Amino acid sequence: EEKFFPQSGVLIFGKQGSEKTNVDIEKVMITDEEEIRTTNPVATEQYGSVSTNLQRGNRQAATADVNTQGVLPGMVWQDRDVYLQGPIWAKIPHTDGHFHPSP
Amino acid sequence: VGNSSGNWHCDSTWMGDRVITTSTRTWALPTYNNHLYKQISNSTSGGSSNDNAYFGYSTPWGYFDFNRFHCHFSPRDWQRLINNNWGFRPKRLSFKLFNIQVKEVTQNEGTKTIANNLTSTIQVFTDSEYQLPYVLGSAHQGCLPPFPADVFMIPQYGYLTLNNGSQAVGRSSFYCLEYFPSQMLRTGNNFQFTYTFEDVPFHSSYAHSQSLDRLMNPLIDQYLYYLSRTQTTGGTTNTQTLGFSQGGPNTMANQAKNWLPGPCYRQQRVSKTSADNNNSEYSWTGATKYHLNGRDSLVNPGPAMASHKDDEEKFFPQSGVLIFGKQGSEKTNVDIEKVMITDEEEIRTTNPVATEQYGSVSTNLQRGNRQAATADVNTQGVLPGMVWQDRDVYLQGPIWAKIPHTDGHFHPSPLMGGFGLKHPPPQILIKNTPVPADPPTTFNQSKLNSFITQYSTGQVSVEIEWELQKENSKRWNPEIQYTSNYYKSTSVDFAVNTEGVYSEPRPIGTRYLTRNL
Numbered sequence A: 001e002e003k004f005f006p007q008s009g010v011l012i013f014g015k016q017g018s019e020k021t022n023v024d025i026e027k028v029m030i031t032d033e034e035e036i037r038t039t040n041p042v043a044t045e046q047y048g049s050v051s052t053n054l055q056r057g058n059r060q061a062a063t064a065d066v067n068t069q070g071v072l073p074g075m076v077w078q079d080r081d082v083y084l085q086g087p088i089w090a091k092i093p094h095t096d097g098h099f100h101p102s103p
Numbered sequence B: 001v002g003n004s005s006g007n008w009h010c011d012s013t014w015m016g017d018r019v020i021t022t023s024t025r026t027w028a029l030p031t032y033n034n035h036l037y038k039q040i041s042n043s044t045s046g047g048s049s050n051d052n053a054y055f056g057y058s059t060p061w062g063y064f065d066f067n068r069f070h071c072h073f074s075p076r077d078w079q080r081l082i083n084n085n086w087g088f089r090p091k092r093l094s095f096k097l098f099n100i101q102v103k104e105v106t107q108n109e110g111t112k113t114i115a116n117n118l119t120s121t122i123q124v125f126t127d128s129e130y131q132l133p134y135v136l137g138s139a140h141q142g143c144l145p146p147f148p149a150d151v152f153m154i155p156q157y158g159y160l161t162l163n164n165g166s167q168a169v170g171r172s173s174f175y176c177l178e179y180f181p182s183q184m185l186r187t188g189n190n191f192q193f194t195y196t197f198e199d200v201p202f203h204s205s206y207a208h209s210q211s212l213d214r215l216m217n218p219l220i221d222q223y224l225y226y227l228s229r230t231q232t233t234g235g236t237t238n239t240q241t242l243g244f245s246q247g248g249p250n251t252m253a254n255q256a257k258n259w260l261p262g263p264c265y266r267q268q269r270v271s272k273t274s275a276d277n278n279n280s281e282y283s284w285t286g287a288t289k290y291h292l293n294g295r296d297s298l299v300n301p302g303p304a305m306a307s308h309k310d311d312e313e314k315f316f317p318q319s320g321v322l323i324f325g326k327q328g329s330e331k332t333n334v335d336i337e338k339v340m341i342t343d344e345e346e347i348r349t350t351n352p353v354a355t356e357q358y359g360s361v362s363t364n365l366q367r368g369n370r371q372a373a374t375a376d377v378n379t380q381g382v383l384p385g386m387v388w389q390d391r392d393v394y395l396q397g398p399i400w401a402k403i404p405h406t407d408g409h410f411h412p413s414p415l416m417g418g419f420g421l422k423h424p425p426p427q428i429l430i431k432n433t434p435v436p437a438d439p440p441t442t443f444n445q446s447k448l449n450s451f452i453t454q455y456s457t458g459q460v461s462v463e464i465e466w467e468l469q470k471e472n473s474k475r476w477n478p479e480i481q482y483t484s485n486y487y488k489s490t491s492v493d494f495a496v497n498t499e500g501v502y503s504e505p506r507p508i509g510t511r512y513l514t515r516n517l
């Protein structure tokens, strides 16, 4: 699925000589993430499917779809890549509640 | 008898990075259930279903309720701490109870007389191993008098175990503290012990200067682009094109950010005015609640959230924040006139608004034939890239809590705000020595029930050492501070009405000092 990519999911880098607006795909270099398809799901894709209520001998068994999700124990992933044509490090917000402050 | 136990030591001190304070007060200790245990389950409930099920007992003993601030600190000092330091935590603690006085009481023909019975004694201890159900942290009332001169009584003690509504599973334990060591103490005999905390992140007592959405410079743009043109507004043939833009000093909303708002949970937006609320009883129905073993229940005093957005003073989460009735509030249906609802117009920088939606996500997969769907997202979970700040302090509230000794826990920061500990300060329990009344002259197989109604008093000492972080910021402009309104009022704030009974005009938070995010 090279054609499709997250609308705002990844990064965009215009080749040398790009104006400020409405430039075309001809100029930028969109970041393909066909690499993490091992651990991390696809944002453009659904995530899972869960039970809707409680099937029974009279009422049919429902199966709800799950697009958005949260985190739970038993989950492992890998943050975004590097892209030297991009940022190198970031700044963590000095607050109290933070989690896996990976950029 | 011919000697007192300990002076009255109750003041505050600011040695700088530390601040020691203690509160000396007096109490009273009445007998209970006539020194008898009880089995309190939904058999004494009288109404509730598997929703308010409870199976526990009632111990004749009592415990201490000093888990608050307005009862440990004075108003001014609180102000002192708040307006000066960014963060703080508790370091050391001590406890002393003495000058005990037992007074038996006879009741001859409605004509009762209170004499003194020094011959008696008392027994009290502390649960270090945390083998007893931690009760505090539930923020039950009957706390130390948020005032010094007034004395009070120690609340009885009762706990609960696993239960199947009106009954209990075998896995429903049973406890009896009288199976523990207790510093048997007679009058004239003093009592003291010592405790120390462990490391805990200082409650971030500060307000942020910027916001997640606005932490980026304006004068510049982002060499990074984004999809700002799905179609081509080149006329009436708005085909499917791909225009892109960068960090517009105006399009900063569409700009690029690296962090994300903390987790959330959708609440029901109510209002302080009446006519703004619909006309239906959703207090227990249209409310935000969870489910557990059928025992469905609320999901607050809180969540990890901020009350509302800008200029929405009228609306507040239904059950999102705390509620504190001014001095002199009954048990039910009192009106908004009495309580002091907690406004959270402070965290609108990091944490979203529970009464508000959270986000909006793609529903399926747009295409040239089928339209692009956009689903709404009220509830959420947590993910990397999320940062927030737990609830505030509210000295008219809890001070710390108790972490459940389990395996799986996460950011055990309390939902009632405050501090959590894997090994919290113990629970103090006391009882009056069972004085068996006149026993039968001849033998009897049964046990003794007859006693002498008696109680005692004494002084509660509690040294709380404190750590702090003061504002070192170069905020050129005068940040905001908290101060009693400088005008003239009839009854001064936190003052004693002409009847000695004093109250608190308003609740107080910490996030005051403008700390750069």
Ligand SMILES: O=S(=O)(O)OC[C@H]1O[C@@](COS(=O)(=O)O)(O[C@H]2O[C@H](COS(=O)(=O)O)[C@@H](OS(=O)(=O)O)[C@H](OS(=O)(=O)O)[C@H]2OS(=O)(=O)O)[C@@H](OS(=O)(=O)O)[C@@H]1OS(=O)(=O)O
Residues within 6 Å of the ligand: A053, A054, A056, A059
């Ligand atoms: O307790 S639960 O609501 O969770 O559900 C299990 C039992 O509830 C029923 C009936 O309710 S009861 O008053 O608690 O006994 O719920 C299911 O049916 C009720 C009304 O149905 S019924 O024809 O009288 O049995 C509906 O709603 S409600 O009770 O929640 O107000 C529910 O269905 S619907 O999708 O709105 O049509 C349904 O419950 S649920 O929404 O799935 O939770 C009985 O359900 S049943 O198993 O499907 O028949 C259960 O009791 S039972 O008599 O043993 O069946």
Ligand SMILES: O=S(=O)(O)OC[C@H]1O[C@@](COS(=O)(=O)O)(O[C@H]2O[C@H](COS(=O)(=O)O)[C@@H](OS(=O)(=O)O)[C@H](OS(=O)(=O)O)[C@H]2OS(=O)(=O)O)[C@@H](OS(=O)(=O)O)[C@@H]1OS(=O)(=O)O
Residues within 6 Å of the ligand: B364, B365, B367, B370
């Ligand atoms: O594989 S997916 O289901 O995820 O979707 C992409 C392709 O599936 C279609 C058709 O299905 S196929 O049998 O796998 O080739 O799904 C979309 O349409 C199907 C039935 O449509 S169609 O007219 O025969 O093309 C619907 O359902 S289902 O296949 O899941 O049972 C879906 O639509 S609906 O909302 O229920 O009406 C729809 O898929 S989805 O629910 O969005 O996942 C084709 O979809 S399309 O791109 O919208 O046309 C895709 O294949 S395609 O032939 O290349 O288009």
Ligand SMILES: [Mg+2]
Residues within 6 Å of the ligand: none
């Ligand atoms: Mg239901």
Ligand SMILES: [Mg+2]
Residues within 6 Å of the ligand: none
């Ligand atoms: Mg589908």
